Amino acid sequence: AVKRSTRLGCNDCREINYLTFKNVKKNPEKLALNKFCSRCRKVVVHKEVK
Amino acid sequence: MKVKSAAKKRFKLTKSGQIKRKHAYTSHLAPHKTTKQKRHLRKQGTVSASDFKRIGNLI
RNA sequence: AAUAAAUAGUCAAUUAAAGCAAUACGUGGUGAAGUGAAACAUCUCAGUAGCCACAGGAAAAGAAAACGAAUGUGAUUCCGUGUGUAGUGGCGAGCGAAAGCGGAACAGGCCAAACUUAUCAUUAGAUAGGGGUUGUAGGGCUUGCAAUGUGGACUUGAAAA
RNA sequence: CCUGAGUAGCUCGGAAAACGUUAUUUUGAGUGAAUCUGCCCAGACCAUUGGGUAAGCCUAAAUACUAAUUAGUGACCGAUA
RNA sequence: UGUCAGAGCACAUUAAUGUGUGAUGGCGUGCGUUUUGAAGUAUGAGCCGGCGAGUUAUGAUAGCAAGCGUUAGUUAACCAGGAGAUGGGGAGCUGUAGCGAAAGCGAGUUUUAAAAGAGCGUUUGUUUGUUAUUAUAGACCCGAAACGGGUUGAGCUAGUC
RNA sequence: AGGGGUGAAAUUCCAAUCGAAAUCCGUGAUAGCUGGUUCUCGUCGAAAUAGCUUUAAGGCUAGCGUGAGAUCACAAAUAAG
RNA sequence: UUCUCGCAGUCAGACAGUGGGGGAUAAGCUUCAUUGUCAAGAGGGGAAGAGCCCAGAUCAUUAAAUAAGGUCCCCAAAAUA
RNA sequence: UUGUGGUAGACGAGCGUUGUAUUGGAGUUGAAGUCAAAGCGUGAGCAUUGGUGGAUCCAAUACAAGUGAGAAUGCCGGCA
RNA sequence: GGACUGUUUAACUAAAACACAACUCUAUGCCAAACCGUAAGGUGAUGUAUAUGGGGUGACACCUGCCCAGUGCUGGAAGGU
RNA sequence: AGCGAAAUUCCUAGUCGGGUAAAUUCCGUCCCGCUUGAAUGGUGUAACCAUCUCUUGACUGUCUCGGCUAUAGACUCGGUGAAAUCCAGGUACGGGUGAAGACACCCGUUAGGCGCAACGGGACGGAAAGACCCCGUGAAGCUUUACUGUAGCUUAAUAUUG
RNA sequence: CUACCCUUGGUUGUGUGCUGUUCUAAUUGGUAACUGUUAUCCAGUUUCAAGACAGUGUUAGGUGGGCAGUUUGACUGGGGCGGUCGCCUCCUAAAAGGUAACGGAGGCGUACAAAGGUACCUUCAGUACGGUUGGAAAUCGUAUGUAGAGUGUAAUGGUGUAAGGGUGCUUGACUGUGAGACAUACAGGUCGAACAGGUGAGAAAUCAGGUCAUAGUGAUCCGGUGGUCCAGUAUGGAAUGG
Ligand SMILES: [Mg+2]
Ligand SMILES: [Mg+2]
Ligand SMILES: [Mg+2]
Ligand SMILES: [Mg+2]
Ligand SMILES: [Mg+2]
Ligand SMILES: [Mg+2]
Ligand SMILES: [Mg+2]
Ligand SMILES: [Mg+2]
Ligand SMILES: [Mg+2]
Ligand SMILES: [Mg+2]
Ligand SMILES: [Mg+2]
Ligand SMILES: [Zn+2]
16 A cells, blocks of 8 residues: 555644545645634644645 | 443444444555545545344344 | 590381372462464463372361451351452453452460579570560569459360160 | 561562452562551542451351161052063 | 956955955066265175164253233242242343443434434333244264374394393 | 384284284264154145355355234236336 | 225245246256246146146045046046048 | 145144052952954054963053164064 | 494385495593483493594505585683673 | 497487398497497406396296196085175166166066076176375474485584683 | 853863873682691682782664574475466357356556546548649648548547547545445455435536546554543543553
């Protein structure tokens, strides 16, 4: 297999909410989206977590 | 008649039969499944009536 | 006796056993495999069989450095239940208590050591006595009061059933 | 003043205990304390609270078993049993 | 290799459209087993008689019947007893409120921000008898080659002395 | 003296048996594998397929039989449109 | 023939008709879909045949009409054109 | 009125055996067992008479099982 | 073919197999090494490298070439793990 | 190096010569030795061999080719008296059919009942739960750089201990 | 001038162990002598050689078929060697769905922060005439054509104003759920209206819980990582679990 997935975590409360897929070999940039966070109850910026 | 030890730890028994169980595919590989599949499998469920005979006498 | 003394050794006297079996029961040492796991090594069969030592009329165990969650039980053993539970297990096959509770039976005693006595080339650190036996801590050491008695895990006689 | 020292622990390998090693319990090797203001215990561990005093001995009863002696029983066999 | 018809013959009864044999016509490739299928050139049985294979203990669920019943039902061990039914014995067992991993809440509760939604619940008992099936014990019966443990054998034979 | 012995070597010989003696015991070893499984009458009446299986001569579940009970009209069948 | 509950059995199939694969429009071959039969099913036709055609055995009758097939004799039954 | 072929296999009703219990009862005027016979039943099975034999046994209702044999290259005995 | 004489698969093989004389290699400095035994003990050996155990070839004559990368064996002395 | 169709060579019954009337075997010889080969030794070698392999003299019933005789049986009489096998049997032949090769079935054919000596075609004769093959989550023995462990052998810390 | 901290060297001093000597009393002896003793074992005394090494107990590395217990697959037109072992699409597959074979062809073990979502605009490839570098074929305008183009990729299905190409804005490649169905032995898979929270695009309706659809993946146990309106073997914590 290839372990291409990755995990997004909120920055205010630092939980590890979301899971997605990203191909490092092309876009080395760290993803920074903004999605719903269950603890914070609103759309917060999520950034990647190892 | 001793209760099967590796069963009494997986099939909690509710009122009026209806053996209760957890769902599989929840321990290992998150990304290969989808969010819909994961939140459908978190909720526990009953045992098919076919295996109810095999399990009731197994408890 | 080597070696002077001494010990080893040798000779004599007295008292015990050595063995058998009830193919059974008990303890203790050592200890498999077949089989199950639908194969198999962890595991189970199993601390089973067998071999061996040791008795006994029964043995072993035993009078708390305990249980364990409470204004609590109060040696051990054995039966039912707790329960096929809490747990443990390549968490597979499988294994399986300790409390608590109801019961059969019921008893708890005694040394070592402090201190003291007599004697040992008293170098005793030893021999024989007294004394003392433990947890709401006890005993010894100094000083008084009350005691003459229950009690048996027990010696000899007599009488009776 | 006394209250059981190569002892309780600690470490290395193992095991009894329901537990495949873990508090408790034992130990082949090594090390090794304290003394009522003490020591151990209440599933790693520390403090508080509470329980008990090891490291010495002895113990009938209930329990297991019957080749044996006596009396007797059997919805047990009745000479291929 | 008998059967359905059927003559002749000889007798005479568990009194019956009777009994024994049966020239002659029609018809006709055994029994268990295992197999797609066997008369089988597939296998088992020489013949007769006897022996011989789904039981038992302890628990689970289901059906049927009985006792007892809505704060129900029910005893085990043990004790007394004709090696008795039974009486005592409520310690426990099931049911009486579920849900939840759990503290907890309670005819509601878990998930959930959610009191929506969904999951699960918002009463139908128990003890015995008997039967079917099932679990642990060899568990219908017979059947290995083998595995492990203890002993007995070099009077044949191999070697050495 | 046997998970041994002996072997001028052959897997020889070890009490008419030897690729690891003989008999006793665990032991009624285990055998998805052959064979056998004993009285009668009545009612009903199959499958020999799919999925998975260190599975393919076996096993589990579904499918098909039977028994007990319900559904009795909108369910299931049989003809035409 | 749907639903619930108890109880199993079965998982080596065969052949004939039909539509195809593999095969060589070869196999009583093999693998499938379908209709039957046999298995688990006797009688009559087939001379004799498990699987074809007709049929689907409660038992007795020394009764009558039929289905497939068939009517010189074996072998029951027909003649005319 | 509709049915009644049938292996595996489910379900129902039953016969027989051995013994125990209570209830009736037969037996040296001959019991069981054993052979023979020209009986009765839907079946498992059941009577009647006679010879032999020489002391236990039959029926009714429950109960409990070492309970029902043609096959196991079955075991034992006998005989071809 | 084997040098020979011999031994062998009792009870289907006596042979071209085994043995053997001789050759070489290796181990072994005596409480030898190898070996049986758990150890004691014992053989080796009341022996001492002109001796003993092991592997391989197999009288006698002539010959026994090449490779030390891999495996094995012996030695190494600084380093690395 | 040697030797070489070999106890080794598949094509290969190689080629060639000798033996032989005739020679897949035999002796010698050449060498594309499929893959010979130097102590798992190579090449020679007198003697020896219950060894193997080929040619040959004598020799003979081995044989053209079969015959004769004598005994012991066999066969008959008297006496004692087994075995394995076996569903019951009163157990024909041809063609066909059939679980595919028939004493029984179908359609024809042939045949008085019963022994005795013989012989072996058949009754897939009898004796052996097929040794081969396959299957079993079967066994044992053996192997190894298969796995896991281990007796031994060796190395270091620690006690014995200065 | 009085202090604290680095690089490098000498010193009296300890403390460790490291190699290396010497000595002996532990210890060893299958050196000798003596006695118990008429004794080749043995015990004791002395001598002789070794000497804190060796041997020995525990602990730990290495080599170790000398030895032990075991596995060493299945399908399979007999078995072996060969091939294959899950998933996806077509044909076989007999016009619903399904349907076997060591039957016929081929693919996957993903890819994209845009190739997602939304608003807006736009719609083939090819051929012919015409045009410097420039050629068969680049691009340019024109017509013609009804898909032969495109659709990330295998085949099939579907799609020409689309599900294809360009642009602006974003991240719904959401959280919590789920009535009702499909196909299914079980496990699992698939589709999804509708509801609450809080968003994106858009004037708004509406759309959005990943892509045009169909593969793109693997149970349980064990252990780890992040959060926690859970428990914490008497109590408070913790360890350890959930
Ligand atoms: Mg505690
Ligand atoms: Mg029968
Ligand atoms: Mg036969
Ligand atoms: Mg040789
Ligand atoms: Mg040679
Ligand atoms: Mg005679
Ligand atoms: Mg034969
Ligand atoms: Mg798009
Ligand atoms: Mg896409
Ligand atoms: Mg895609
Ligand atoms: Mg606490
Ligand atoms: Zn947040």
